[PDB]
Scaffold this active site. Structure first.
Site, short mmCIF file in Angstrom:
data_model
loop_
_atom_site.label_atom_id
_atom_site.label_comp_id
_atom_site.label_asym_id
_atom_site.label_seq_id
_atom_site.Cartn_x
_atom_site.Cartn_y
_atom_site.Cartn_z
N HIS A 53 0.85 -1.19 0.00
CA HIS A 53 0.00 0.00 0.00
C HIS A 53 0.88 1.24 0.00
O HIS A 53 1.82 1.33 0.79
CB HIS A 53 -0.91 0.01 1.23
CG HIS A 53 -1.50 -1.32 1.56
ND1 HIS A 53 -2.59 -1.84 0.88
CD2 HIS A 53 -1.18 -2.23 2.50
CE1 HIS A 53 -2.91 -3.01 1.40
NE2 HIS A 53 -2.07 -3.28 2.39
N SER A 76 1.08 0.31 -5.30
CA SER A 76 0.27 -0.07 -4.14
C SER A 76 -0.36 -1.44 -4.37
O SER A 76 -0.66 -1.81 -5.50
CB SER A 76 -0.82 0.97 -3.89
OG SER A 76 -1.91 0.40 -3.21
N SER A 81 -5.99 1.65 -1.12
CA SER A 81 -5.02 1.86 -0.04
C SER A 81 -3.99 2.95 -0.28
O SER A 81 -3.28 3.34 0.64
CB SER A 81 -4.31 0.54 0.28
OG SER A 81 -3.36 0.19 -0.72
N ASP A 129 3.35 -7.53 -0.64
CA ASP A 129 2.38 -7.44 0.44
C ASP A 129 1.07 -7.98 -0.10
O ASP A 129 0.27 -7.23 -0.67
CB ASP A 129 2.19 -5.99 0.88
CG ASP A 129 1.36 -5.88 2.14
OD1 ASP A 129 0.56 -6.81 2.39
OD2 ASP A 129 1.51 -4.88 2.87
N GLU A 154 4.86 -9.51 3.46
CA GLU A 154 4.54 -8.82 4.70
C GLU A 154 3.22 -9.16 5.36
O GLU A 154 3.02 -8.88 6.53
CB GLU A 154 4.60 -7.31 4.47
CG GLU A 154 5.19 -6.53 5.64
CD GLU A 154 4.37 -5.32 5.96
OE1 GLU A 154 3.41 -5.06 5.22
OE2 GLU A 154 4.67 -4.63 6.95
N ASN A 179 5.73 -11.16 7.91
CA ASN A 179 4.50 -11.06 8.68
C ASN A 179 4.53 -11.87 9.96
O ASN A 179 3.91 -11.49 10.95
CB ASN A 179 3.30 -11.54 7.85
CG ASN A 179 2.08 -11.81 8.71
OD1 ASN A 179 1.13 -11.02 8.72
ND2 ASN A 179 2.08 -12.93 9.42
N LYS A 184 6.38 -8.23 14.30
CA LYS A 184 5.48 -7.92 13.21
C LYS A 184 4.03 -8.28 13.54
O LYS A 184 3.19 -7.41 13.76
CB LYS A 184 5.90 -8.66 11.93
CG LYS A 184 5.48 -7.98 10.63
CD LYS A 184 3.99 -7.68 10.59
CE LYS A 184 3.39 -7.95 9.22
NZ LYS A 184 1.98 -8.43 9.28
N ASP A 188 1.81 -5.29 14.73
CA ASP A 188 1.17 -4.65 13.59
C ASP A 188 -0.31 -5.07 13.45
O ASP A 188 -1.21 -4.25 13.60
CB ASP A 188 1.96 -4.99 12.32
CG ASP A 188 1.25 -4.60 11.04
OD1 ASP A 188 0.10 -5.04 10.82
OD2 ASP A 188 1.84 -3.84 10.25
N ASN A 189 -0.54 -6.35 13.19
CA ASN A 189 -1.90 -6.85 13.03
C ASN A 189 -2.75 -6.59 14.27
O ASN A 189 -3.91 -6.18 14.17
CB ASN A 189 -1.89 -8.37 12.75
CG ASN A 189 -0.94 -8.76 11.63
OD1 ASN A 189 -0.04 -8.01 11.26
ND2 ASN A 189 -1.13 -9.95 11.09
N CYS A 193 -4.40 -2.65 13.93
CA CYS A 193 -5.82 -2.78 13.63
C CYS A 193 -6.68 -2.24 14.77
O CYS A 193 -7.76 -1.71 14.53
CB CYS A 193 -6.18 -4.25 13.37
SG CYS A 193 -5.63 -4.88 11.75
N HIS A 299 -6.97 -8.66 4.29
CA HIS A 299 -6.28 -8.24 3.07
C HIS A 299 -7.13 -8.26 1.81
O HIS A 299 -7.55 -7.20 1.34
CB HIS A 299 -5.02 -9.08 2.85
CG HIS A 299 -4.21 -8.64 1.66
ND1 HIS A 299 -3.42 -7.51 1.67
CD2 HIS A 299 -4.09 -9.17 0.42
CE1 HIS A 299 -2.85 -7.36 0.49
NE2 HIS A 299 -3.24 -8.35 -0.29
N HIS A 351 -2.74 1.77 9.55
CA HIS A 351 -2.04 1.70 10.83
C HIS A 351 -1.19 2.95 11.02
O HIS A 351 -0.74 3.55 10.05
CB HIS A 351 -1.13 0.47 10.89
CG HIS A 351 -1.86 -0.83 10.95
ND1 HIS A 351 -1.21 -2.05 10.89
CD2 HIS A 351 -3.18 -1.12 11.04
CE1 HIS A 351 -2.10 -3.03 10.94
NE2 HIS A 351 -3.30 -2.49 11.03
N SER A 359 7.07 -3.48 11.52
CA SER A 359 6.96 -4.31 10.33
C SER A 359 7.97 -3.90 9.27
O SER A 359 8.69 -4.74 8.72
CB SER A 359 5.54 -4.22 9.76
OG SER A 359 4.57 -4.50 10.76
N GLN A 363 11.16 -5.47 7.28
CA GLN A 363 11.22 -5.46 5.82
C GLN A 363 12.58 -5.02 5.30
O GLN A 363 13.09 -5.56 4.32
CB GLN A 363 10.14 -4.54 5.27
CG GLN A 363 8.77 -5.20 5.10
CD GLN A 363 8.72 -6.21 3.97
OE1 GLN A 363 7.69 -6.84 3.74
NE2 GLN A 363 9.83 -6.38 3.26
#
Ligand SMILES: NC(=O)c1ccc[n+]([C@@H]2O[C@H](COP(=O)([O-])OP(=O)(O)OC[C@H]3O[C@@H](n4cnc5c(N)ncnc54)[C@H](O)[C@@H]3O)[C@@H](O)[C@H]2O)c1
Ligand SMILES: NC(=O)c1ccc[n+]([C@@H]2O[C@H](COP(=O)([O-])OP(=O)(O)OC[C@H]3O[C@@H](n4cnc5c(N)ncnc54)[C@H](O)[C@@H]3O)[C@@H](O)[C@H]2O)c1
Ligand SMILES: NC(=O)c1ccc[n+]([C@@H]2O[C@H](COP(=O)([O-])OP(=O)(O)OC[C@H]3O[C@@H](n4cnc5c(N)ncnc54)[C@H](O)[C@@H]3O)[C@@H](O)[C@H]2O)c1
Ligand SMILES: NC(=O)c1ccc[n+]([C@@H]2O[C@H](COP(=O)([O-])OP(=O)(O)OC[C@H]3O[C@@H](n4cnc5c(N)ncnc54)[C@H](O)[C@@H]3O)[C@@H](O)[C@H]2O)c1
Ligand SMILES: Nc1ncnc2c1ncn2C[C@@H](O)[C@@H](O)C(=O)O
Ligand SMILES: Nc1ncnc2c1ncn2C[C@@H](O)[C@@H](O)C(=O)O
Ligand SMILES: Nc1ncnc2c1ncn2C[C@@H](O)[C@@H](O)C(=O)O
Ligand SMILES: Nc1ncnc2c1ncn2C[C@@H](O)[C@@H](O)C(=O)O
Lengths: 430, 430, 430, 430
Positions: A53, A76, A81, A129, A154, A179, A184, A188-189, A193, A299, A351, A359, A363
């Protein structure tokens, strides 16, 4: 390739740079990778073709990769996104970026193909991603396969597919599963979120969460982060799951776990954090309360059946971009968000930068790994050394002014672990 | 061996059986193993020597193993963790149990040795909690080693040592790491301590958590479960850690992460959820506020330096069993609980039965695995198949009236996983 | 009167005094009233007849009133709420206390009557909790009415009746409504029950709250504190209410609000925080899940229909003191706690000392007001000056090491309020 | 008066009507007042001059008052609180509205004056928010005083001043204190800010709350709602207060209470929920961490000293509307939001519609009261009958599908209260 880049408005760059400026100061991980590698330039000679994204945070990732001497061509991984001011700052910066908010399936693919060929040759690296890029290449541009030194997935959905490929000896280039890094997935998730979900919803519908029965399908890190969020604003969160272990965690957290076949009749807000198809069908839509807010955060948009809404609604009215209010034959209304695509990114800014540094640090590392030490990564999806995973977390501890404790020689002896060496066994689920 | 058993009071069995009775109806896992294996008796021929806190919940575990045709001789793995009414109901039942609340280091060992020899031979199995049994045997009764078909470690501390032995080729018999089962670690250590910690504290000091600054050392599942508990009652929880990743989780949860060297001066309640030595020293004691409640929940009592308290206090007064109020030369008071040993078990009844059914179900399984399919477990610590881990969770879902979802043929296909088959990769950190 | 006092065991005083000793250091309010009034003795000449649960915290209240020169004769306002070691310490101290855990309706009244007459005359003051004492007098000993300078009701239920009497010109002596002090209601009923509820449950059944559906009748401060408690341990709390305003708060907090007629079929734990009759009937009992934990926390035990259980159960078995396991004709079991009486006090130690210092400080003040400035309180229930209510809170801030802010001359001017003067209008609902 | 109205863009109406359309369905209170009074038109003959933020929710209030036969001329009570599409839909509807986002102090006053004179006469009613209107009239247009039948204050700050006037016999027309209605204060200020605070912050800075130390000045309902919000996202909330009772509640909730003089050095996010001046000064600014997000949510912008920032900053850069990033002489950056004015309304869309229905329902009622039964409201600020306060809550229960309980004849008798009659004494603090 063709045009240097292509975006919504380059006159948005001046603004995007301000966003990037503020964003940079909130991503200690990426800025950290910059100080120690700006000179070294471990990525020198690399031609990374990314499909992530195009947001302000991703902008810092791209500018970091370049700082490391890499050559980047971005796009992206979602038609909604993209952040147009962020992409504008990147293109204006000279980085070939082909992404703009609101592309078409056709324009989306063109944008991806646009990143395959560089000045001095085709892509020799992949930062994906969702798997869209690695999949396109594997099934459409095999010729370029043998030249890619590595992949960088990711997201869960993509990494999921990464394994699937291997399961069928389809994967033809070594991949690193980003991921699934502790720093990560669990940050992140889950944490992202938690903050980005409600945003997508609010900015979209501006609804009050308090006192509303929200239904969350799936209890993974995203489902966990989402649930917690709604629950924290005063909403009654009901969870649906297929995994008994993930189901128990929810029940143990005081959440009611049922089937969407049951929940659809009680939910006021429907969020799909699953990565599976047929999560919200017409059989549920025909059962939802008037003005029910339905949206997905997984996703790929394969969970909610929007076609049904469009093929069975009595009327479809668009409130504003990414916000449609359908009218069912039963007189009930259904507010569909972001056309079923990612809600935090499609209706909000995604995020926050601080968590994205986690994350994205993973990467930058994954890339240096695959590029720098290729022979260390045979064809197959790999994880990042825990020592590195630890390096990510430790990089953001300072901004938060956290004061970590240091094991003494005696304690380290007692525990039988290096004062600094990895403090957790691999199997550790943090 | 010697006496049939030995306990505090057998006249407590009548009551303990009532406790067991109610307990059973709250442990769907164990009761489940009972229905499908009572007849099969897969443990038939087995002589299990256990070293697990002798509580009511453990009583159900013992009565389950026996229902599975096993031969059991028990003992508690803590000089204070024993539940005298529970142990009475077991002995009165005919099961050779040698455990009573408040044993001496000498009486404790005696109890363990008491479980090594059976009627028809020595122990051929081990169900340990803390490693104490497996360690005694490996270093004191090697002769019996070659006869033991397997080990069953239930706690982190123990499992930690299990690996340490293998690391030095000391482990001489195949072990199964139960503590590290998803349904075990993420539910027992986390959800149990959350409820059992405050219990130990309250039953001991009867203090009010609200408005107090509590300090928790270590952010593992226990540290996480403890913190959440205090935090939920109105206490300001401060966390100390050595792991950056676990430290970031804390920070990301709104907890201040610092050094005990700093926290000691602010904390009102000190909880050590670490498994390491020298966590709370006199250097901190001399810095604690008046009437500071200090206690440990980590398996072995090696975290708090009680000796210092006993060697440097101006005066020591005992409030009641497992509650001592010291007076420091600075005039400040320090309330030490359970003499530094486990607080939830030493001052309270331990984790509730519902959550213990998860851990114990894993235990019954671990035993059936090692015993039944031994050749499948070479000398070394192993995990339980995820399919089984799933079986545990799935077994308590019903009691909670949870309605799990069933993948359709199309979805399973999409996800590329069996409608029932393990739903998560092994590396999954739930 | 008759015997100097009467209790369960005077040899429990030595212990009770230790409890009192630790309790004192946790009640800054009472100890504070001590330092500034120990010499002054504003209560000198007063003969206070109390009817409040005889616990360790109440012990500090009695010893405080006495320090204020008062003459006290106590008794518990509940047949199970008495703390025998606390009562022993008091009696042994010379204070005529007639209370013991587990009295009979007959013995209970005897104990109350035992406090009406003093050495130098009958009671000239009343410190009630539940109204039992003020009611007995008004309806059975009118002769002593005209001699009582004032009343001090501490609980909602009691204060409820205090107004009822006035509503019918029945109240014949000026009362002060202590329960309705900001520092009383918002801290005692709410924060105390939050911590004391689960205690009574655990100590009695030792059940795991996590993953259980708990039903709470009534969303007052007690209901609010209870709900928050269970919800925080992982239980799904469902609330039932008759007030739309209290119902909205719940809904706004993410709690499902229904009728007991509906909830009874889903609840795993039933808690009645109402002060009304017929909350849990057999029509619900016949609908409860096996082994359903039913208990009440409302002052008077008039909410749960226990007679029905005893008259319709197939069998009744007592697990232990205040814990009975019934067996319904349908096969389901029902665990009744404390015979329907207060659960936190009947099965646990009640609210912690720190929060009790708030209510009790208000109590010491109520007494000093009525006694000292009688002519200021005409027959009728009154409230304590907000300036005083502020004095209570202010007294416990220190222990919590809270650093309050001081308005400047300019700010106080702006706000138009005294730098210290009451900072909130009377109607303020904090 | 002059022009029919004046707004930012009337071409924004078409959209605003959609917003209104969705909004209406989320405000059961207002729509309820519509059904039962649309015909009755109790407000017939009334000329209401309003001064409340011109948002979508307020739009439904205006259209409701009109539905009640009232004559309305509106204006926003904040130079940034105006929602241009909402105002557009109203003007396009024929209602004289003079408000647009981003007015000037001069344009702001002009707008207010524009609402004093109607077709058939001057304003005979007042619906204020902040007291700005009732103050302008009292001190600038006394002539129109004697014609105004009543006032309707909606915010604390306003109502605060309402009493001040009366305190000095300045208030010359009967006012109704709407902000202090149970359904108003405990739901709007608390639940609204909880959801609307983070919005303003995020939409402005898009910062991640998790892991950050947020500082909240003042612990009123707004402070309570704000704190809870940040706290729930993983931020460490520190509170500062002048009231000991409000400070104890915070402490009892696990929040650290200190002085800004101390917190300014630790906070990452500063929120002023106070209604007082000199809350955040340069003495604190000079002490803030780099990139510290500072914003105010208290009605009037008098808490943060922005002038100092503009007079002592080394450089000031505007990120975007209502977002300025200053650079201090110490090298540290300070992100000032909405120029110190209300943050939720100035940077976001304000409180959600569902909660605004509560406050606004009270407004429609206050208006019908003053207008209909004037002689019942002598000059002075009054409250709304609890029976009415109850009517509001009860009106939103349905949308939440809440199933309230109905007292039986026996219970109402026992409690001594009408099955429907007010269920709480006046002093009740819900
Ligand atoms: N938009 C974003 O910001 C963002 C961020 C991270 C991840 N994601 C995406 O969200 C998805 C979920 O990621 P995750 O990390 O939480 O995955 P996860 O594997 O941890 O959890 C997904 C959960 O879905 C449950 N599930 C599967 N089929 C189901 C069904 N039919 N009904 C109910 N539950 C079902 C699974 O049991 C599992 O627990 C992925 O597609 C991922 O790429 C989006
Ligand atoms: N009493 C009980 O009911 C109960 C239940 C489960 C586990 N336990 C015991 O509790 C202990 C912790 O178990 P766990 O599963 O949470 O372990 P864990 O490995 O998950 O976590 C322990 C944590 O301590 C931290 N730590 C280590 N040394 C430290 C130091 N000097 N200062 C601060 N932090 C430090 C580590 O980084 C780690 O995160 C073990 O001994 C285990 O056997 C007790
Ligand atoms: N055991 C303890 O430690 C302790 C501490 C404080 C108070 N109490 C007692 O608890 C009771 C509650 O006190 P409170 O201050 O919270 O009272 P409260 O008036 O604030 O709340 C009681 C609530 O019950 C609701 N209610 C009434 N009848 C109902 C019914 N039939 N169904 C559902 N809800 C119903 C009411 O609407 C009200 O909100 C009183 O008897 C009080 O004396 C006990
Ligand atoms: N923007 C919005 O959406 C919104 C919504 C409701 C209220 N408000 C406004 O917010 C303000 C707060 O309203 P409220 O209902 O919470 O008021 P409140 O009286 O309940 O609380 C204000 C708190 O500030 C504390 N305080 C005062 N001076 C202080 C100082 N110098 N330092 C620290 N604390 C201090 C007071 O003790 C009090 O507890 C009012 O101006 C109100 O009009 C704004
Ligand atoms: N600002 C963002 N930039 C990039 N990706 C974003 C962003 N917000 C959410 N995601 C989704 C990712 O967190 C998810 O795809 C993943 O990394 O798993
Ligand atoms: N009732 C109990 N029976 C047995 N063990 C108990 C109990 N409560 C806590 N532990 C500690 C264990 O959870 C811990 O040692 C582990 O299993 O890891
Ligand atoms: N230790 C205690 N001493 C006295 N009363 C106690 C105690 N715990 C709970 N209550 C009940 C009271 O909080 C309640 O009756 C009230 O004061 O309203
Ligand atoms: N949409 C909105 N319409 C009107 N006022 C709003 C809104 N959001 C916040 N406030 C602030 C009010 O809640 C506050 O001023 C109050 O009523 O006390």
């Amino acid at each position: 390739d063709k045009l240097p880049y292509k975006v919504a408005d380059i006159g948005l760059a001046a603004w995007g740079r301000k966003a990037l400026d503020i964003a940079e100061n909130e991503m200690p991980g990426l800025m950290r990778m910059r100080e120690m590698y700006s000179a070294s330039k471990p990525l020198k000679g690399a031609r990374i073709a990314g499909c992530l994204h195009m947001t302000v945070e991703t902008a810092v990732l791209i500018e970091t990769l370049v700082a490391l001497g890499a050559e980047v061509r971005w796009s992206s991984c979602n038609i909604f996104s993209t952040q147009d001011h962020a992409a504008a700052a990147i293109a204006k910066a000279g980085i070939p970026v082909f992404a703009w908010k609101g592309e078409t399936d056709e324009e989306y693919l063109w944008c991806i193909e646009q990143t395959l060929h560089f000045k001095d040759g085709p892509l020799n690296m992949i930062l994906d991603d969702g798997g869209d890029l690695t999949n396109l290449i594997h099934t459409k541009h095999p010729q370029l396969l043998s030249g890619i030194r590595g992949i960088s997935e990711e997201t869960t959905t993509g990494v999921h597919n990464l394994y699937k490929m291997m399961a069928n000896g389809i994967l033809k280039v070594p991949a690193i599963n980003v991921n699934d890094s502790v720093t990560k997935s669990k940050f992140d998730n889950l944490y992202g979120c938690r903050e980005s979900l409600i945003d997508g919803i609010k900015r979209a519908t501006d609804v009050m969460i308090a006192g509303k029965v929200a239904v969350v399908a799936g209890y993974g890190d995203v489902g966990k982060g989402c649930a917690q969020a709604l629950r924290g604003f005063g909403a009654r969160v009901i969870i649906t799951e297929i995994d008994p272990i993930n189901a128990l965690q929810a029940a143990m957290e005081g959440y009611e776990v049922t089937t969407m076949d049951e929940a659809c009749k009680e939910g006021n807000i429907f969020v799909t954090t699953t990565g599976c198809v047929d999560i919200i069908l017409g059989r549920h839509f025909e059962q939802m309360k008037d003005d029910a807010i339905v949206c997905n955060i997984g996703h790929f948009d394969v969970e909610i059946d929007v076609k049904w809404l469009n093929e069975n609604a009595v009327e479809k009215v668009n409130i504003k971009p990414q916000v449609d209010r359908y009218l069912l034959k039963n007189g009930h209304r259904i507010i569909l968000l972001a056309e079923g695509r990612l809600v935090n990114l499609g209706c909000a800014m995604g995020h926050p930068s601080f968590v994205m540094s986690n994350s994205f640090t993973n990467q930058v590392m994954a890339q240096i790994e695959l590029w720098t030490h290729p022979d260390k990564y045979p064809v197959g999806v790999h994880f990042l050394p825990k020592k590195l995973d630890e390096a990510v977390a430790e990089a953001h501890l300072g901004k938060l002014n956290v004061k970590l404790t240091k094991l003494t020689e005696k304690q380290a002896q007692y525990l039988g672990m290096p004062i600094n060496g990895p403090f957790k066994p691999d199997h550790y689920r943090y």
